[PDB]
Short mmCIF file of N, CA, C and O and ligand atoms in Angstrom, two decimals:
data_model
loop_
_atom_site.label_atom_id
_atom_site.label_comp_id
_atom_site.label_asym_id
_atom_site.label_seq_id
_atom_site.Cartn_x
_atom_site.Cartn_y
_atom_site.Cartn_z
N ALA A 1 92.49 101.79 75.61
CA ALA A 1 93.80 101.89 76.32
C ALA A 1 93.52 102.21 77.79
O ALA A 1 92.45 102.73 78.06
N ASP A 2 94.44 101.83 78.66
CA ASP A 2 94.30 102.05 80.10
C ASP A 2 95.39 103.00 80.57
O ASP A 2 96.52 103.02 80.09
N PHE A 3 95.01 103.93 81.47
CA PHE A 3 95.93 104.91 82.03
C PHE A 3 95.80 104.88 83.55
O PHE A 3 94.80 104.39 84.03
N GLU A 4 96.79 105.39 84.26
CA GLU A 4 96.77 105.44 85.71
C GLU A 4 97.06 106.86 86.19
O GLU A 4 97.92 107.54 85.64
N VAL A 5 96.30 107.28 87.18
CA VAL A 5 96.52 108.57 87.84
C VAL A 5 96.69 108.27 89.32
O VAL A 5 95.84 107.59 89.92
N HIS A 6 97.75 108.77 89.92
CA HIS A 6 98.04 108.52 91.34
C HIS A 6 97.62 109.70 92.21
O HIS A 6 97.80 110.85 91.86
N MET A 7 97.02 109.37 93.34
CA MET A 7 96.57 110.34 94.35
C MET A 7 97.60 110.37 95.47
O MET A 7 97.81 109.36 96.16
N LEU A 8 98.28 111.49 95.61
CA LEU A 8 99.40 111.61 96.53
C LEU A 8 99.28 112.78 97.50
O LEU A 8 98.79 113.84 97.16
N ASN A 9 99.85 112.58 98.70
CA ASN A 9 99.90 113.67 99.68
C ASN A 9 100.88 114.74 99.25
O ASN A 9 100.70 115.92 99.57
N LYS A 10 101.93 114.37 98.53
CA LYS A 10 102.89 115.36 98.05
C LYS A 10 103.58 114.87 96.79
O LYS A 10 103.90 113.71 96.62
N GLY A 11 103.80 115.83 95.89
CA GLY A 11 104.47 115.52 94.62
C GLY A 11 105.21 116.77 94.16
O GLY A 11 105.34 117.75 94.88
N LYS A 12 105.62 116.73 92.90
CA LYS A 12 106.35 117.83 92.29
C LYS A 12 105.63 119.16 92.38
O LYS A 12 106.22 120.21 92.68
N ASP A 13 104.31 119.16 92.20
CA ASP A 13 103.53 120.38 92.26
C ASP A 13 103.08 120.79 93.65
O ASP A 13 102.31 121.76 93.77
N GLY A 14 103.57 120.14 94.70
CA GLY A 14 103.25 120.54 96.06
C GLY A 14 102.37 119.49 96.75
O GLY A 14 102.43 118.30 96.42
N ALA A 15 101.63 119.97 97.73
CA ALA A 15 100.79 119.08 98.52
C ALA A 15 99.46 118.77 97.84
O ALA A 15 98.87 119.62 97.19
N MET A 16 98.95 117.57 98.09
CA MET A 16 97.63 117.10 97.70
C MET A 16 97.41 117.21 96.19
O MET A 16 96.75 118.11 95.68
N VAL A 17 98.01 116.23 95.50
CA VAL A 17 98.02 116.28 94.04
C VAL A 17 97.59 114.98 93.38
O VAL A 17 97.70 113.89 93.90
N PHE A 18 97.11 115.18 92.15
CA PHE A 18 96.88 114.08 91.23
C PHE A 18 98.12 114.10 90.31
O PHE A 18 98.54 115.16 89.86
N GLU A 19 98.68 112.93 90.05
CA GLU A 19 99.81 112.82 89.12
C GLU A 19 99.58 111.71 88.13
O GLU A 19 99.48 110.55 88.51
N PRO A 20 99.47 112.03 86.84
CA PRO A 20 99.55 113.36 86.30
C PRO A 20 98.28 114.17 86.51
O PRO A 20 97.22 113.59 86.78
N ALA A 21 98.37 115.50 86.49
CA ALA A 21 97.20 116.34 86.70
C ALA A 21 96.53 116.75 85.40
O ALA A 21 95.51 117.43 85.39
N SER A 22 97.15 116.40 84.28
CA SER A 22 96.65 116.70 82.94
C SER A 22 96.86 115.45 82.08
O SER A 22 97.99 114.94 82.08
N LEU A 23 95.81 114.92 81.49
CA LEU A 23 95.93 113.71 80.68
C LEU A 23 95.00 113.80 79.50
O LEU A 23 93.86 114.24 79.65
N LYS A 24 95.43 113.35 78.32
CA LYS A 24 94.56 113.24 77.15
C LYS A 24 94.42 111.75 76.80
O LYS A 24 95.41 111.02 76.75
N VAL A 25 93.18 111.32 76.73
CA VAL A 25 92.85 109.92 76.43
C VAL A 25 91.90 109.89 75.23
O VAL A 25 91.35 110.92 74.84
N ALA A 26 91.71 108.70 74.64
CA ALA A 26 90.72 108.57 73.56
C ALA A 26 89.36 108.20 74.14
O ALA A 26 89.26 107.61 75.21
N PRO A 27 88.28 108.50 73.41
CA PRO A 27 86.95 108.10 73.83
C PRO A 27 86.90 106.60 74.02
O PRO A 27 87.41 105.83 73.19
N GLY A 28 86.37 106.16 75.15
CA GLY A 28 86.30 104.74 75.48
C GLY A 28 87.49 104.25 76.27
O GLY A 28 87.46 103.09 76.71
N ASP A 29 88.54 105.05 76.45
CA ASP A 29 89.69 104.63 77.23
C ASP A 29 89.33 104.62 78.73
O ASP A 29 88.36 105.25 79.14
N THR A 30 90.11 103.87 79.49
CA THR A 30 89.86 103.79 80.93
C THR A 30 91.04 104.39 81.67
O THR A 30 92.20 104.34 81.27
N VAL A 31 90.73 105.03 82.80
CA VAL A 31 91.70 105.64 83.69
C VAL A 31 91.42 105.09 85.10
O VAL A 31 90.25 105.12 85.50
N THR A 32 92.44 104.55 85.74
CA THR A 32 92.28 104.10 87.12
C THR A 32 92.91 105.16 88.03
O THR A 32 94.08 105.47 87.83
N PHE A 33 92.13 105.64 88.99
CA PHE A 33 92.62 106.59 90.00
C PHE A 33 93.07 105.78 91.21
O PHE A 33 92.27 105.02 91.79
N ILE A 34 94.35 105.78 91.52
CA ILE A 34 94.95 104.91 92.51
C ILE A 34 95.30 105.62 93.81
O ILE A 34 96.04 106.60 93.77
N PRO A 35 94.84 105.07 94.93
CA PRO A 35 95.09 105.62 96.25
C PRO A 35 96.46 105.29 96.76
O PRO A 35 96.64 104.51 97.70
N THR A 36 97.50 105.89 96.18
CA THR A 36 98.89 105.63 96.57
C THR A 36 99.07 106.04 98.02
O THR A 36 99.69 105.33 98.80
N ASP A 37 98.49 107.18 98.35
CA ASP A 37 98.38 107.62 99.74
C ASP A 37 96.92 107.45 100.15
O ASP A 37 96.04 107.63 99.31
N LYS A 38 96.69 107.21 101.44
CA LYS A 38 95.32 107.09 101.93
C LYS A 38 94.66 108.44 102.13
O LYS A 38 95.36 109.46 102.24
N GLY A 39 93.34 108.48 102.13
CA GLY A 39 92.58 109.67 102.43
C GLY A 39 92.09 110.46 101.24
O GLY A 39 91.65 111.61 101.39
N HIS A 40 92.15 109.87 100.05
CA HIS A 40 91.76 110.57 98.83
C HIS A 40 90.66 109.85 98.08
O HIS A 40 90.41 108.64 98.26
N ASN A 41 89.98 110.54 97.20
CA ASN A 41 88.99 109.98 96.29
C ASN A 41 89.04 110.84 95.02
O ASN A 41 89.87 111.73 94.90
N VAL A 42 88.11 110.57 94.10
CA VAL A 42 88.00 111.37 92.89
C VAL A 42 86.54 111.67 92.66
O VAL A 42 85.67 110.79 92.85
N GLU A 43 86.20 112.87 92.25
CA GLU A 43 84.84 113.31 91.99
C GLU A 43 84.85 114.33 90.86
O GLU A 43 85.79 115.12 90.75
N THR A 44 83.84 114.30 90.00
CA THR A 44 83.79 115.33 88.96
C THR A 44 83.48 116.68 89.58
O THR A 44 82.73 116.79 90.59
N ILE A 45 84.02 117.73 88.99
CA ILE A 45 83.77 119.11 89.42
C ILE A 45 82.51 119.66 88.77
O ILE A 45 82.38 119.51 87.54
N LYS A 46 81.63 120.28 89.53
CA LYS A 46 80.43 120.89 88.97
C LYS A 46 80.76 121.92 87.90
O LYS A 46 81.67 122.73 88.01
N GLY A 47 80.06 121.84 86.76
CA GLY A 47 80.29 122.74 85.65
C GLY A 47 81.46 122.34 84.77
O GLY A 47 81.85 123.07 83.85
N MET A 48 82.09 121.20 85.06
CA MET A 48 83.27 120.79 84.31
C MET A 48 83.13 119.39 83.71
O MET A 48 84.08 118.62 83.71
N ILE A 49 81.93 119.02 83.26
CA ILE A 49 81.81 117.73 82.57
C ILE A 49 81.03 118.04 81.29
O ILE A 49 80.16 118.90 81.27
N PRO A 50 81.32 117.29 80.23
CA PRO A 50 80.68 117.56 78.95
C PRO A 50 79.24 117.07 78.87
O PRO A 50 78.78 116.25 79.66
N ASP A 51 78.56 117.56 77.82
CA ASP A 51 77.19 117.09 77.58
C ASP A 51 77.22 115.58 77.33
O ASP A 51 78.11 115.02 76.70
N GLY A 52 76.21 114.91 77.88
CA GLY A 52 76.05 113.48 77.74
C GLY A 52 76.81 112.65 78.76
O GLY A 52 76.66 111.42 78.78
N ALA A 53 77.64 113.28 79.59
CA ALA A 53 78.37 112.55 80.60
C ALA A 53 77.62 112.61 81.93
O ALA A 53 76.87 113.55 82.17
N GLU A 54 77.91 111.66 82.80
CA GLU A 54 77.31 111.65 84.13
C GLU A 54 78.38 111.97 85.19
O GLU A 54 79.52 111.55 85.02
N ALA A 55 77.97 112.66 86.24
CA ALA A 55 78.90 112.93 87.34
C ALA A 55 79.25 111.64 88.07
O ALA A 55 78.48 110.66 88.05
N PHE A 56 80.39 111.59 88.73
CA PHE A 56 80.80 110.45 89.52
C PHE A 56 81.54 110.93 90.77
O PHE A 56 82.04 112.05 90.82
N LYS A 57 81.56 110.05 91.77
CA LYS A 57 82.22 110.33 93.04
C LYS A 57 82.67 109.01 93.64
O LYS A 57 81.78 108.18 93.93
N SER A 58 83.94 108.74 93.79
CA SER A 58 84.41 107.46 94.32
C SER A 58 84.44 107.56 95.84
O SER A 58 84.30 108.65 96.41
N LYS A 59 84.62 106.40 96.47
CA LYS A 59 84.74 106.36 97.93
C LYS A 59 86.18 106.59 98.35
O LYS A 59 87.14 106.30 97.63
N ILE A 60 86.37 107.16 99.55
CA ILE A 60 87.73 107.36 100.04
C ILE A 60 88.49 106.04 100.03
O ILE A 60 87.96 105.01 100.48
N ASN A 61 89.73 106.01 99.56
CA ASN A 61 90.62 104.87 99.55
C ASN A 61 90.38 103.80 98.49
O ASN A 61 91.19 102.88 98.45
N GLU A 62 89.34 103.94 97.68
CA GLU A 62 89.15 102.90 96.67
C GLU A 62 89.92 103.21 95.38
O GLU A 62 90.13 104.36 94.97
N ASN A 63 90.36 102.13 94.75
CA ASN A 63 90.97 102.17 93.43
C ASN A 63 89.79 102.30 92.47
O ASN A 63 88.94 101.40 92.45
N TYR A 64 89.67 103.40 91.76
CA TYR A 64 88.50 103.70 90.97
C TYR A 64 88.77 103.74 89.48
O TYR A 64 89.53 104.59 89.00
N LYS A 65 88.18 102.79 88.77
CA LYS A 65 88.37 102.72 87.32
C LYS A 65 87.17 103.36 86.63
O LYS A 65 86.01 103.06 86.92
N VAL A 66 87.46 104.30 85.73
CA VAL A 66 86.45 105.02 84.98
C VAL A 66 86.67 104.78 83.48
O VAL A 66 87.79 104.98 82.99
N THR A 67 85.62 104.41 82.78
CA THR A 67 85.65 104.34 81.31
C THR A 67 85.03 105.65 80.84
O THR A 67 83.87 105.91 81.14
N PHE A 68 85.83 106.50 80.19
CA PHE A 68 85.31 107.79 79.75
C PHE A 68 84.50 107.61 78.48
O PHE A 68 84.97 107.00 77.51
N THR A 69 83.25 108.06 78.52
CA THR A 69 82.35 107.85 77.39
C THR A 69 82.19 109.09 76.54
O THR A 69 82.76 109.14 75.45
N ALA A 70 81.48 110.10 77.01
CA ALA A 70 81.26 111.30 76.20
C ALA A 70 82.55 112.05 76.01
O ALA A 70 83.33 112.23 76.96
N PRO A 71 82.83 112.55 74.81
CA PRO A 71 84.02 113.31 74.54
C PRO A 71 83.95 114.70 75.17
O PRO A 71 82.86 115.26 75.26
N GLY A 72 85.11 115.24 75.46
CA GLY A 72 85.19 116.58 76.04
C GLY A 72 86.20 116.59 77.18
O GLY A 72 86.93 115.65 77.41
N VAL A 73 86.25 117.73 77.87
CA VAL A 73 87.13 117.90 79.02
C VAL A 73 86.37 117.69 80.34
O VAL A 73 85.25 118.17 80.47
N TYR A 74 87.01 116.89 81.17
CA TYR A 74 86.46 116.59 82.50
C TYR A 74 87.36 117.19 83.58
O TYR A 74 88.55 116.85 83.59
N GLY A 75 86.82 118.01 84.45
CA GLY A 75 87.57 118.49 85.63
C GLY A 75 87.25 117.55 86.79
O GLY A 75 86.09 117.18 87.01
N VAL A 76 88.28 117.09 87.49
CA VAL A 76 88.12 116.18 88.62
C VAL A 76 88.80 116.76 89.86
O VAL A 76 89.74 117.54 89.76
N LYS A 77 88.25 116.39 91.01
CA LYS A 77 88.81 116.86 92.27
C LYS A 77 88.84 115.69 93.24
O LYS A 77 88.17 114.66 93.09
N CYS A 78 89.62 115.86 94.29
CA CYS A 78 89.55 115.01 95.47
C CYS A 78 88.62 115.74 96.43
O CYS A 78 88.91 116.89 96.77
N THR A 79 87.53 115.13 96.86
CA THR A 79 86.53 115.82 97.69
C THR A 79 87.03 116.52 98.94
O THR A 79 86.85 117.74 99.05
N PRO A 80 87.77 115.85 99.81
CA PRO A 80 88.23 116.50 101.05
C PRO A 80 89.30 117.52 100.75
O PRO A 80 89.46 118.45 101.57
N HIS A 81 90.05 117.41 99.67
CA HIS A 81 91.19 118.27 99.41
C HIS A 81 91.02 119.26 98.26
O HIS A 81 91.99 119.89 97.86
N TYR A 82 89.78 119.50 97.87
CA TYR A 82 89.47 120.43 96.78
C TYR A 82 89.90 121.85 97.11
O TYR A 82 90.47 122.54 96.25
N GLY A 83 89.68 122.29 98.36
CA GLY A 83 90.10 123.63 98.74
C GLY A 83 91.61 123.77 98.79
O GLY A 83 92.14 124.88 98.68
N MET A 84 92.35 122.69 98.97
CA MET A 84 93.79 122.66 98.96
C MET A 84 94.34 122.53 97.53
O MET A 84 95.55 122.48 97.36
N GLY A 85 93.44 122.44 96.55
CA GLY A 85 93.91 122.37 95.16
C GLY A 85 94.10 120.99 94.59
O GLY A 85 94.79 120.90 93.55
N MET A 86 93.54 119.94 95.19
CA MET A 86 93.77 118.60 94.62
C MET A 86 92.77 118.33 93.51
O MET A 86 91.61 117.97 93.71
N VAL A 87 93.21 118.70 92.29
CA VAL A 87 92.39 118.68 91.09
C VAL A 87 93.21 118.22 89.89
O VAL A 87 94.43 118.18 89.91
N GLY A 88 92.48 117.85 88.85
CA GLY A 88 93.15 117.41 87.60
C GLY A 88 92.14 117.58 86.48
O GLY A 88 90.96 117.89 86.66
N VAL A 89 92.65 117.37 85.25
CA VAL A 89 91.81 117.47 84.07
C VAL A 89 92.10 116.29 83.13
O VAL A 89 93.24 115.87 82.97
N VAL A 90 91.03 115.71 82.60
CA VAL A 90 91.14 114.63 81.63
C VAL A 90 90.44 115.11 80.37
O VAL A 90 89.26 115.43 80.37
N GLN A 91 91.19 115.16 79.27
CA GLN A 91 90.60 115.48 77.96
C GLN A 91 90.32 114.15 77.24
O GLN A 91 91.23 113.33 77.12
N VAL A 92 89.06 113.99 76.86
CA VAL A 92 88.67 112.75 76.15
C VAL A 92 88.40 113.09 74.69
O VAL A 92 87.44 113.79 74.37
N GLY A 93 89.30 112.63 73.82
CA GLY A 93 89.15 112.88 72.39
C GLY A 93 89.75 114.20 71.94
O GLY A 93 90.29 114.99 72.72
N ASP A 94 89.69 114.40 70.63
CA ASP A 94 90.20 115.62 70.02
C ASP A 94 89.09 116.67 70.01
O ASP A 94 87.90 116.38 70.11
N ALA A 95 89.46 117.94 69.88
CA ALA A 95 88.53 119.05 69.76
C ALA A 95 87.37 118.99 70.74
O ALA A 95 86.19 118.91 70.40
N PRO A 96 87.69 119.12 72.03
CA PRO A 96 86.68 119.11 73.08
C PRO A 96 85.76 120.31 72.97
O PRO A 96 86.21 121.45 73.09
N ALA A 97 84.47 120.07 72.80
CA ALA A 97 83.50 121.14 72.60
C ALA A 97 83.22 121.98 73.83
O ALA A 97 82.70 123.09 73.70
N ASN A 98 83.50 121.47 75.02
CA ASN A 98 83.21 122.21 76.24
C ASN A 98 84.46 122.87 76.81
O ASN A 98 84.40 123.34 77.94
N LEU A 99 85.56 122.94 76.07
CA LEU A 99 86.80 123.50 76.56
C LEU A 99 86.64 124.92 77.06
O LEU A 99 87.07 125.27 78.17
N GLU A 100 86.02 125.78 76.25
CA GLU A 100 85.84 127.18 76.67
C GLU A 100 84.89 127.29 77.84
O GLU A 100 85.12 128.13 78.73
N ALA A 101 83.89 126.43 77.98
CA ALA A 101 82.96 126.43 79.10
C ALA A 101 83.62 126.02 80.41
O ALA A 101 83.37 126.56 81.50
N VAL A 102 84.54 125.06 80.35
CA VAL A 102 85.29 124.60 81.52
C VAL A 102 86.24 125.67 82.03
O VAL A 102 86.45 125.77 83.25
N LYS A 103 86.78 126.51 81.16
CA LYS A 103 87.67 127.59 81.60
C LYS A 103 86.93 128.61 82.45
O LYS A 103 87.57 129.26 83.29
N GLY A 104 85.63 128.78 82.26
CA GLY A 104 84.85 129.74 83.00
C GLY A 104 84.27 129.21 84.30
O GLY A 104 83.70 130.01 85.06
N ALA A 105 84.38 127.91 84.57
CA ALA A 105 83.82 127.34 85.79
C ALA A 105 84.53 127.93 87.01
O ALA A 105 85.72 128.21 86.95
N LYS A 106 83.78 128.07 88.08
CA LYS A 106 84.27 128.66 89.32
C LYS A 106 84.81 127.61 90.27
O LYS A 106 84.28 126.51 90.42
N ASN A 107 85.98 127.86 90.83
CA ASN A 107 86.67 126.98 91.75
C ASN A 107 87.37 127.81 92.83
O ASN A 107 87.71 128.98 92.59
N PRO A 108 87.69 127.19 93.96
CA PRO A 108 88.47 127.89 94.99
C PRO A 108 89.83 128.24 94.41
O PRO A 108 90.34 127.54 93.52
N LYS A 109 90.47 129.29 94.87
CA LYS A 109 91.72 129.79 94.34
C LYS A 109 92.79 128.77 94.07
O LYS A 109 93.32 128.74 92.94
N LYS A 110 93.18 127.94 95.01
CA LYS A 110 94.27 126.98 94.82
C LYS A 110 93.90 125.96 93.74
O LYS A 110 94.79 125.56 92.98
N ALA A 111 92.64 125.54 93.70
CA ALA A 111 92.23 124.63 92.63
C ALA A 111 92.28 125.37 91.31
O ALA A 111 92.75 124.74 90.34
N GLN A 112 91.83 126.60 91.20
CA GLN A 112 91.84 127.32 89.93
C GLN A 112 93.24 127.51 89.39
O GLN A 112 93.47 127.34 88.17
N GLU A 113 94.21 127.77 90.25
CA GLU A 113 95.60 127.94 89.83
C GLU A 113 96.13 126.67 89.18
O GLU A 113 96.76 126.73 88.11
N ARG A 114 95.82 125.52 89.75
CA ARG A 114 96.26 124.25 89.20
C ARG A 114 95.42 123.83 88.01
O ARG A 114 96.00 123.28 87.05
N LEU A 115 94.15 124.18 87.97
CA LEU A 115 93.34 123.81 86.79
C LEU A 115 93.78 124.62 85.59
O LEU A 115 93.88 124.07 84.48
N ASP A 116 94.08 125.89 85.79
CA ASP A 116 94.52 126.74 84.68
C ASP A 116 95.81 126.19 84.10
O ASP A 116 95.97 126.12 82.86
N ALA A 117 96.72 125.72 84.94
CA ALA A 117 97.99 125.15 84.47
C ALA A 117 97.75 123.83 83.76
O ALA A 117 98.31 123.57 82.68
N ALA A 118 96.86 122.99 84.27
CA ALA A 118 96.57 121.71 83.63
C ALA A 118 95.89 121.90 82.29
O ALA A 118 96.18 121.16 81.31
N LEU A 119 94.97 122.84 82.18
CA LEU A 119 94.30 123.14 80.92
C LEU A 119 95.29 123.66 79.89
O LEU A 119 95.25 123.27 78.71
N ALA A 120 96.26 124.48 80.31
CA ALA A 120 97.26 125.03 79.40
C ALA A 120 98.17 123.95 78.89
O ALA A 120 98.61 123.96 77.72
N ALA A 121 98.45 122.91 79.66
CA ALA A 121 99.30 121.79 79.31
C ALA A 121 98.65 120.91 78.25
O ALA A 121 99.37 120.14 77.62
N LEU A 122 97.34 121.03 78.04
CA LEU A 122 96.68 120.23 77.00
C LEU A 122 96.67 120.97 75.67
O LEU A 122 96.24 120.45 74.63
N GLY A 123 97.15 122.21 75.66
CA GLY A 123 97.18 123.00 74.41
C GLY A 123 96.12 124.09 74.61
O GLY A 123 95.51 124.60 73.67
N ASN A 124 95.97 124.43 75.88
CA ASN A 124 95.05 125.46 76.33
C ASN A 124 93.63 125.10 75.94
O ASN A 124 93.10 124.14 76.57
CU1 CU B 201 92.79 114.06 98.53
#
């Protein structure tokens, strides 16, 4: 299945957001990160990817399609706007084994506030 996440300068949750910021997909599903506004990219957050997965970092302004392979929770950020809280979470599959490990990862305050809310929206 294919899903879309939009990168926006402003949305319901404030400035510099991914919409949706919380998504559950099946293993092997694809998610396209779309540059609705210019100046954004997507990158995995250190300490927030599951075993067997590889980190990724898209280029500013590109439409980036990712096929999620290893199951688990992935924390993603926009590189230039990470300190402003532009982050999201993608859960791949049921019963993510790294869920408790991702909750302990360190992030700047504004990103942590939004990651905690996105993680809780998946069923904590
Ligand atoms: Cu951004």
